[PDB]
Amino acid sequence: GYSDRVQQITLGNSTITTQEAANAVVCYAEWPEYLPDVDASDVNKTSKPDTSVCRFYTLDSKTWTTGSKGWCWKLPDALKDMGVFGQNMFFHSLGRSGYTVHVQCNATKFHSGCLLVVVIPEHQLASHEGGNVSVKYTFTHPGERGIDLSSANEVGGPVKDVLYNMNGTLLGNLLIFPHQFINLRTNNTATIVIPYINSVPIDSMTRHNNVSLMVIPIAPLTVPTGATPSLPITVTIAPMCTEFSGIRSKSIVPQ
Amino acid sequence: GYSDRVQQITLGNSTITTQEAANAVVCYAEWPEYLPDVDASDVNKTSKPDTSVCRFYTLDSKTWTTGSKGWCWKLPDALKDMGVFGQNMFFHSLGRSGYTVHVQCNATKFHSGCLLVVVIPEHQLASHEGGNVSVKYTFTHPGERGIDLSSANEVGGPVKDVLYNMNGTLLGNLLIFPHQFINLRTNNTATIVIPYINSVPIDSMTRHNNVSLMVIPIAPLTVPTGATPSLPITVTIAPMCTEFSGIRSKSIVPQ
Amino acid sequence: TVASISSGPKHTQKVPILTANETGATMPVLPSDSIETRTTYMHFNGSETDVECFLGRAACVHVTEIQNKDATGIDNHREAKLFNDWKINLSSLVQLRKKLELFTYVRFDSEYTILATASQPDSANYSSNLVVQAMYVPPGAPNPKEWDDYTWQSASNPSVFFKVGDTSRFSLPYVGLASAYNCFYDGYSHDDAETQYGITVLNHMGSMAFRIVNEHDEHKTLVKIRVYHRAKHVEAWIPRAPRALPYTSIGRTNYPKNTEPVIKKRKGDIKSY
Amino acid sequence: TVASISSGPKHTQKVPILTANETGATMPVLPSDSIETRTTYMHFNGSETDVECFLGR
Amino acid sequence: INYYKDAASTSSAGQSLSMDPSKFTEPVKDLMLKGAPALN
Amino acid sequence: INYYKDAASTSSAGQSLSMDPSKFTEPVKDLMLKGAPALN
Amino acid sequence: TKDEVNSYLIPLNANRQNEQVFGTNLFIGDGVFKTTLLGEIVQYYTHWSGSLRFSLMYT
Amino acid sequence: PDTYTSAGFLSCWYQTSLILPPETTGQVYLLSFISACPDFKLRLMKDTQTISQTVALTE
Numbered sequence A, B: 001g002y003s004d005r006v007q008q009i010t011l012g013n014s015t016i017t018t019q020e021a022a023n024a025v026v027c028y029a030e031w032p033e034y035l036p037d038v039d040a041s042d043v044n045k046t047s048k049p050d051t052s053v054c055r056f057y058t059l060d061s062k063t064w065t066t067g068s069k070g071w072c073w074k075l076p077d078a079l080k081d082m083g084v085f086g087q088n089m090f091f092h093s094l095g096r097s098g099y100t101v102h103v104q105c106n107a108t109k110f111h112s113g114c115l116l117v118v119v120i121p122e123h124q125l126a127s128h129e130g131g132n133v134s135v136k137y138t139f140t141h142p143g144e145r146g147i148d149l150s151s152a153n154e155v156g157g158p159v160k161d162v163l164y165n166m167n168g169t170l171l172g173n174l175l176i177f178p179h180q181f182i183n184l185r186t187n188n189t190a191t192i193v194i195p196y197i198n199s200v201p202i203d204s205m206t207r208h209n210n211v212s213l214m215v216i217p218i219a220p221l222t223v224p225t226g227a228t229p230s231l232p233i234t235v236t237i238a239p240m241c242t243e244f245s246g247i248r249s250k251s252i253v254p255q
Numbered sequence C: 001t002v003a004s005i006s007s008g009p010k011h012t013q014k015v016p017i018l019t020a021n022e023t024g025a026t027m028p029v030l031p032s033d034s035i036e037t038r039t040t041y042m043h044f045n046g047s048e049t050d051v052e053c054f055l056g057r058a059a060c061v062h063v064t065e066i067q068n069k070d071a072t073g074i075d076n077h078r079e080a081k082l083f084n085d086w087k088i089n090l091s092s093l094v095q096l097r098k099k100l101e102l103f104t105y106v107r108f109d110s111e112y113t114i115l116a117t118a119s120q121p122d123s124a125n126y127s128s129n130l131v132v133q134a135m136y137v138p139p140g141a142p143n144p145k146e147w148d149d150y151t152w153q154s155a156s157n158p159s160v161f162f163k164v165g166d167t168s169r170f171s172l173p174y175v176g177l178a179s180a181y182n183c184f185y186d187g188y189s190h191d192d193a194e195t196q197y198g199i200t201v202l203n204h205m206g207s208m209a210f211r212i213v214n215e216h217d218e219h220k221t222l223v224k225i226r227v228y229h230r231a232k233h234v235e236a237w238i239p240r241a242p243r244a245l246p247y248t249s250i251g252r253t254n255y256p257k258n259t260e261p262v263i264k265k266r267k268g269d270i271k272s273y
Numbered sequence D: 001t002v003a004s005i006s007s008g009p010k011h012t013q014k015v016p017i018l019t020a021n022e023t024g025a026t027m028p029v030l031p032s033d034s035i036e037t038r039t040t041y042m043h044f045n046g047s048e049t050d051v052e053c054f055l056g057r
Numbered sequence E, F: 001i002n003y004y005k006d007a008a009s010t011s012s013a014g015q016s017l018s019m020d021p022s023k024f025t026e027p028v029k030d031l032m033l034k035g036a037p038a039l040n
Numbered sequence G: 001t002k003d004e005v006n007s008y009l010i011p012l013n014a015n016r017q018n019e020q021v022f023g024t025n026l027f028i029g030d031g032v033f034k035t036t037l038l039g040e041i042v043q044y045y046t047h048w049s050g051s052l053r054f055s056l057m058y059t
Numbered sequence H: 001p002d003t004y005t006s007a008g009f010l011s012c013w014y015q016t017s018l019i020l021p022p023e024t025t026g027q028v029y030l031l032s033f034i035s036a037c038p039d040f041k042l043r044l045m046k047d048t049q050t051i052s053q054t055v056a057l058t059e
Helices: A083-091 A171-176 B084-091 B171-176 C051-055 C092-098 D051-055 G031-035 G037-042
Strands: A007-011 A014-018 A062-065 A071-075 A094-102 A111-123 A179-183 A189-195 A210-220 A232-248 B007-011 B013-020 B062-065 B071-075 B092-102 B112-121 B179-183 B189-194 B211-222 B230-247 C002-004 C059-066 C083-087 C103-119 C133-138 C159-161 C167-172 C207-212 C221-239 D002-004 D008-012 G008-012 G020-027 G043-047 G052-059 H009-013 H028-036 H043-044
Touching: A007 A094, A007 A232, A014 A094, A062 A210, A083 A094, A083 A232, A094 A111, A094 A210, A111 A171, A111 A189, A171 A210, A171 B084, A171 G037, A179 A189, A179 B062, A189 B179, B007 B092, B007 B171, B007 B230, B013 B092, B013 H043, B084 B092, B112 B171, B171 B230, B179 B189, B189 C059, B211 B230, C051 C092, C051 C103, C051 C221, C059 C083, C059 C092, C059 C207, C092 D051, C103 C133, C103 C159, C103 D008, C133 C167, C133 C221, C159 C167, C159 G020, C221 G031, G008 G020, G020 G031, G020 H028, H009 H043
Parallel strands: none
Antiparallel strands: A007 A014, A062 A232, A071 A210, A094 A189, A094 A232, A111 A179, A111 A210, B007 B013, B007 D008, B062 B230, B071 B211, B092 B189, B092 B230, B112 B179, B112 B211, C059 C221, C083 C207, C103 C167, C103 C221, C133 C159, C133 C207, G008 H028, G020 H009, G043 H043, G052 H028
């Protein structure tokens, strides 16, 4: 009586149940694991807070309306302030982590709409100015708020044009990245497990984000007659196999 | 060529060397160890940050002068703000820890003076008011500053009379507690290893301090002629075998 | 190898063509799941689509130019194109760039070919024979200031001398600092509020300085340098969506404003053929 | 080859970090004598620092 | 025959002949069998 | 393959792979053990 | 202001408490490090990795 | 020196304080050394900014 459909994920002191899942994706078919010695470089023993950092943090909720263009969060940024995960983050020189991402959106059998939930490794954004204008730090570190693709261009911020993925590629091809759809008629959640993907064994958690999670409405939300025209979307994310190394004074970052 | 005299303690990412030690005391002849299952009650898996919390924090320095009466720090309070030790502390419901305490005071072969360095398990202080006046919270949670026994009585604070240990017992008998002397002529540091001592397996780190460390001048400081009449005393302390459990929202404590 | 097996009529309870794309999978459906097929063999291996093959041919990565002329009274050799440097890149001419950015991290050895041809746009009695010197200048080395500085001694820095009209060829190991070169980097060099975004040393491949060794003849001679780059021993990770809009800058993802629709509009209906 | 071995807390009478430089020696002290380390391998031979290589171009 | 000492100096590599699209086409956590229902 | 008769004409030598810093880092007459006191 | 034997000497003051003796960044190819043998050799190469040993002898 | 690639800082402070014996006075100095651990790797040789010249030397 197991269905692909019902699932339970327990991680730390927190549990999620979905009764309307559509399997789960594990990026590149690899599950998060700690850093092996053969791959290690820094000689420091690392710190593995385990259950105090590897639990589920639910970010603040978004509201899908007929005019929504899509939202974008960066990792580990989105979690920069969650509990002890965040403290560890500002206090060590280097850290490394994988995540379980669970995006939630329920409706009824009269609604229609379909969101794309995708994880993009190394999502370098484009400046809407063109040329070689850079995208300032603050703009690519929105924190739990994430970036709202239907917000206005700002100065020093990225471009927010959806048919171009914020980088000069077409929305249609985002499907080459680990992703899952939430089609109100099928699905009510999306779950993706992200292994740590980098060109170095461990890195800085503040100067470099290693994935952007993106939720994009593709088939517009259509509510039943005289229904309220909107649904909330909630994102809950859990660091998994986290390791921190090179402890010290506590980083100070712009803004 | 090993002497009782020279020592090195490396704990985490921090190391201490003393070239003029007088052995080291291990309270009640027991070395800190984690909490065994047979002794466990709370069902929660605990978090053991290891090297990020088990390193040496050096508190701010004191100044021994001919008029000094002695100083008193409480644990884990004194460390409530040190790095990730402190964060963990405010963020979990329960925690447990042992410590290595290293008290430092060097002079020259012309100085004289002798400090008592003692650890008192469950040091319940007395109100200087008498009767059944209580000692308010803030007063018994001085933080890294500790309590200065030569400061004035304050209201809601403890009594600071040294011949009575702040509790109705005589200074002379403090020697029944694990302790070590720093006699300028012999010694320049004192080191005590404290195992976790409580009547419960794990407790709250904020509502209850489980040891007071006390440094008390007993033979007054006497400097050579026309020397400056004072010496600094420094206290460095390292949590060891720390475990935190029952993570959540982050305690808010008076003042 | 069979490309298709033989398959006949089906009337089952087992439907391989109905799936749920919401899952993120592309189910491996074949012609034989939905029509009746006959056996056929592949006759093919997919040899020429190997990434080593795809990135393994020489591509022009840079065209520069230097001239041989009397430096007498020139206050700025660099500025007179008496000599010229180039900080190696693979993202300035777009053909090879789009190919590499199909991947996120890439690791390979480089084989460089350098073709140099001379031009004599104004009245010369003859064509002189010039020798070019190409010096590889790693970050931290003294940089040439004049076309005949002590720098050109290049006692510790690899340099090649070849003749204009000829070609020079040598191969450099993978010089990246990390395990792969980042084709993309969503980071900064530090948490500065104004530091540059995206451009990184993670990509840095050295830099190269060119000059003519010859002193000047009576006429002037323009020498134009073309650097070709061939990846050998290629390793590529994490495929990405291909580049759709035009490029504007080395190292940023930025596209031009008021660009044109990249999807061709139908001449007719959705229903049109 | 290991570049660093794993090493944990120390509370000894044996202090490798105190020396007397007046002797003229450079005592071979390592990260693992004064912090807690994890194993890591060298992955490197020192090929390009051979004097034949240094004077050989 | 390599005429040169260093590995970078050798010619192009030879075909992976590796080929396994499943990390890209089927990264699902619970295995899907073609023919069985997608969602049970 | 050497094509030439004289030894000077051969290519570069090959890595010492000798490496022993102790003549430079520890030329002391009585051996010093790390961890033991420097001066006894 | 001119090279002197004195720039090898880090001074110490009697009776100061809590205060700072010296500070430097660790760009081994520049600044204080640059003229040392280590600094001087590092400069013949482009990349370095590894641990450094910094010792202080008291006089 | 490069940012992305930067290595940190090194500082030194009084832990307690220097104390001179009687009949003694003034500043005392520390000598400081640097050498590389056996850990160390250097690669990709290049030319040093530490030496240059304007005309060839002669005897």
